[PDB]
Design an enzyme around this catalytic site. Structure first.
Site, PDB file in Angstrom:
ATOM      1  N   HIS A  62    -129.826  -8.336 -15.511  1.00  0.00           N
ATOM      2  CA  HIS A  62    -128.508  -8.115 -14.856  1.00  0.00           C
ATOM      3  C   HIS A  62    -128.488  -6.808 -14.085  1.00  0.00           C
ATOM      4  O   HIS A  62    -127.606  -6.681 -13.209  1.00  0.00           O
ATOM      5  CB  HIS A  62    -127.304  -8.181 -15.810  1.00  0.00           C
ATOM      6  N   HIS A  92    -128.174   3.073 -14.581  1.00  0.00           N
ATOM      7  CA  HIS A  92    -128.342   1.831 -13.819  1.00  0.00           C
ATOM      8  C   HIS A  92    -127.372   1.850 -12.665  1.00  0.00           C
ATOM      9  O   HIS A  92    -126.509   2.690 -12.583  1.00  0.00           O
ATOM     10  CB  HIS A  92    -128.132   0.623 -14.716  1.00  0.00           C
ATOM     11  N   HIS A  94    -124.900  -0.916  -9.961  1.00  0.00           N
ATOM     12  CA  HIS A  94    -124.292  -2.200  -9.593  1.00  0.00           C
ATOM     13  C   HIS A  94    -124.228  -2.202  -8.072  1.00  0.00           C
ATOM     14  O   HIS A  94    -123.969  -1.169  -7.452  1.00  0.00           O
ATOM     15  CB  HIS A  94    -122.889  -2.375 -10.195  1.00  0.00           C
ATOM     16  N   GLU A 104    -118.008  -1.155  -8.630  1.00  0.00           N
ATOM     17  CA  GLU A 104    -117.131  -1.709  -9.701  1.00  0.00           C
ATOM     18  C   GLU A 104    -115.792  -1.013  -9.594  1.00  0.00           C
ATOM     19  O   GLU A 104    -114.779  -1.684  -9.340  1.00  0.00           O
ATOM     20  CB  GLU A 104    -117.804  -1.507 -11.048  1.00  0.00           C
ATOM     21  N   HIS A 117    -124.198   4.366 -12.642  1.00  0.00           N
ATOM     22  CA  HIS A 117    -123.669   4.665 -13.973  1.00  0.00           C
ATOM     23  C   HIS A 117    -124.711   5.431 -14.810  1.00  0.00           C
ATOM     24  O   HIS A 117    -125.747   4.835 -15.135  1.00  0.00           O
ATOM     25  CB  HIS A 117    -123.268   3.380 -14.723  1.00  0.00           C
ATOM     26  N   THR A 196    -118.624  -2.357 -18.584  1.00  0.00           N
ATOM     27  CA  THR A 196    -118.259  -3.342 -17.534  1.00  0.00           C
ATOM     28  C   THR A 196    -119.103  -4.612 -17.648  1.00  0.00           C
ATOM     29  O   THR A 196    -118.911  -5.504 -16.842  1.00  0.00           O
ATOM     30  CB  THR A 196    -118.362  -2.742 -16.127  1.00  0.00           C
TER      31      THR A 196
HETATM   32 SE1  LIG Z   1    -121.312  -0.431 -17.345  1.00  0.00          SE
HETATM   33  C1  LIG Z   1    -121.962   1.203 -18.329  1.00  0.00           C
HETATM   34  C2  LIG Z   1    -122.809   0.856 -19.528  1.00  0.00           C
HETATM   35  C3  LIG Z   1    -123.852  -0.065 -19.444  1.00  0.00           C
HETATM   36  C4  LIG Z   1    -124.608  -0.388 -20.563  1.00  0.00           C
HETATM   37  C5  LIG Z   1    -124.360   0.226 -21.783  1.00  0.00           C
HETATM   38  C6  LIG Z   1    -123.373   1.177 -21.866  1.00  0.00           C
HETATM   39  C7  LIG Z   1    -122.595   1.490 -20.753  1.00  0.00           C
HETATM   40 ZN   LIG Z   2    -122.660  -0.129 -15.306  1.00  0.00          ZN
END
Ligand SMILES: [SeH]Cc1ccccc1
Ligand SMILES: [Zn+2]
Length: 258
Positions: A62, A92, A94, A104, A117, A196
């Site tokens: 994802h 990561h 998005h 987001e 993020h 999210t």
């Molecule tokens: Se969407 C931010 C997040 C992603 C994975 C685990 C924790 C927090």
């Molecule tokens: Zn995220």
């Protein structure tokens, strides 16, 4: 029939497996810049990444995660709205199929091309799995990406993506300095929210920087060559892996700046 970002398994379906999808502190949200109140009691953020130890990059089907050694206080976020010390575990992104979508969070309904993020966990809960069970367990630093000039500090990430094209692939990814992904200003908005992605746990203090970073069209085009699928499976490009804005409900967004 697992969750994802398709017609049959996308965000509008997640509530069947994860009823907290319709909860009281879901993320992301639209940031109405005129309604956000300046909170002069907030502190400057403290982003301390000089000892960060990156280990690996993973395509998890994802997104891709750049993972850090979080077995000690090496890369930590403190200050701003936070009480105590939060340790960097991964970052990561998005992103969209086109430059007009991908973030987001939105700002006055504006969508950015992507959103970074940086995920941190509260060290008073001892491990990430315990922290996500707590309302103050995580702090996520959100940074918007717009398309224009290249971000030199992103290129090392871009160039390893061909080695993790498909779900479940990982590659060694040592000595990556996440300070090269930050904008100049640490002015931010903050509110209480959630992961999210499933399990959508309501454990996040969100800290969303006002200043976007610029990346090049070539850099984001390489994000869009990743695959949601596993090796040998029908190709489905990893694009539009973003959740849309959720109702704000009984929450106030606070600004660090006037
Ligand atoms: Se969407 C931010 C997040 C992603 C994975 C685990 C924790 C927090
Ligand atoms: Zn995220």
């Amino acid at each position: 029939h697992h969750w994802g970002y398709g017609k049959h398994n996308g965000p509008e379906h997640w509530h069947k497996d994860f009823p907290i999808a319709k909860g009281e502190r879901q993320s992301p949200v639209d940031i109405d810049t005129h309604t956000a109140k300046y909170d002069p009691s907030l502190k400057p953020l403290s982003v301390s990444y000089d000892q960060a130890t990156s280990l690996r990059i993973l395509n998890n089907g994802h997104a891709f995660n750049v993972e850090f050694d979080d077995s000690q206080d090496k890369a930590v976020l403190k200050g701003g709205p936070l009480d105590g010390t939060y340790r960097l575990i991964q970052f990561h992104f998005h992103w969209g199929s086109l430059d007009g979508q991908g973030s987001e969070h939105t700002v006055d309904k504006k969508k950015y091309a992507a959103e970074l993020h940086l995920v941190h966990w509260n060290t008073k809960y001892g491990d990430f799995g315990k922290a996500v069970q707590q309302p103050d367990g995580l702090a996520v630093l959100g940074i918007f990406l717009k398309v224009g000039s290249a971000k030199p500090g992103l290129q090392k990430v871009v160039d390893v993506l061909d080695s993790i094209k498909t779900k479940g692939k990982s590659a060694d990814f040592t000595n990556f300095d996440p300070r090269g992904l930050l904008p100049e200003s640490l002015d931010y908005w903050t509110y209480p929210g959630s992961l999210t992605t499933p399990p959508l746990l309501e454990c996040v203090t969100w800290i969303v920087l006002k200043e976007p970073i610029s990346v090049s069209s070539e850099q984001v085009l390489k994000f869009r060559k990743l695959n949601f699928n596993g090796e040998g499976e029908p190709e489905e490009l990893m694009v539009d892996n973003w959740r849309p804005a959720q109702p704000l409900k009984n929450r106030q967004i606070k600004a660090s700046f006037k």
